[model samples]
Target: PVTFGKNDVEIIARETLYRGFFSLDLYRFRHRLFNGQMSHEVRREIFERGHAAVLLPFDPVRDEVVLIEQIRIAAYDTSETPWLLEMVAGMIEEGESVEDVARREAIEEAGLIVKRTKPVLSFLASPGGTSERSSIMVGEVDATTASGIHGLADENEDIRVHVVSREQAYQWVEEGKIDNAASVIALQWLQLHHQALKNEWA
Candidate 1:
């Protein structure tokens, strides 16, 4: 907090490693050390897949949470099930705000009507490899009416909806059934503060 920002890091060169659906860039740089000396030149690669806005929809009246399940190619190897229980999340478009993406994905992915939305937090998807950031929001919705399959057919989305009690969602989190970081974080956030939220939101 005392000093140094982006000025601390010096970029020597950059070259694109891949450019397709996702772009990867290799960067060579040096950074100022704590001893006030420039450190050795280092090379780092970054993945630029843009950012996402994620929202966890809460049905306070029903004491339930709405989650979506869809196939995730990335989890094919590590997870027993590739389809993850995740929040309504989508990439933020060029001109769209974070909140806008959250509201839009709620309907497109879960057929939810978001009544109110509040910030939860923003986090990097992975700072070591990806330059993608995620903004989290807690949205109030009428999840009692949310059901069936929903998604943009053009996007090749095949999603299934699940509405479950808050305790069950949190229990899955503990049992490692909900393994993704964003969903885990959001559900845990709800677990810790659901009472207060329900008091205010319901």
Candidate 2:
């Protein structure tokens, strides 16, 4: 096995396959053990494509949050509930920044305009399996007049917009009502930082 250390990390026996769109590789790494040396062999795949999602159109004055509900095909294929309550989210289209995607998805899914955005987190959704990186942002909005089923019918998107209170949203999380990753993290962050957020909005 090939062994070397770089930037304080050790890499060994690296091979690559399928180097476009999706990638597959094998590697062996070494670690210094207290009494000996330990080695680990791992197979990794890097899918260079990335996506961005946002929990947008938050109404702090009214203590309400906006969300969208839609049918996910993957969930249906897996024998799970196809209808999922999720934040306004979409893949970052070509020639767009994450911020641009966030704003666009907010309007498309929820029919609301986000005035400003505050980033919540960036994380790997499934690092062990897929190279899907997601950046999440929360934005301030006016939800008073935001409601209805929105989305491009050409895309067969039938999305329902929901306006709910922070308390109600927390109950959903506690009762396992939420299943989407972006919504869960956004709501939890809102719950923890709601006061400060509200102050800023005010």
Question: Each model's TM-score, in the order given?
Answer: 0.94, 0.77
What count of clashes does model 2 give?
0
Q: Which one wins on TM-score? A: 1
Candidate 2, 28-126: lDDT as tens digits: 556544444554654455445556666555788899888788888877875358888888887877778778888888886777888878888877877
The residue pairs found clashing in candidate 1 are: none
lDDT of 1 by residue, 1-202 (tens): 7696699999999989999988999989999998999989999999999999999999888889999999998899999989999999999989999999999999988988899898998888789998899989999998777869643453466789999998999999999999898998899999988999999976
Query: In angstroms, how far off is 88's CA in candidate 1?
Result: 0.4
- What is each predicted model's overall lDDT from 0 to 1? 0.90, 0.75
Q: Candidate 1: misplaced stretches above 4 Å?
A: 1-4, 150-155
The 10-residue segment of model 1 with minimum total lDDT is: 149-158
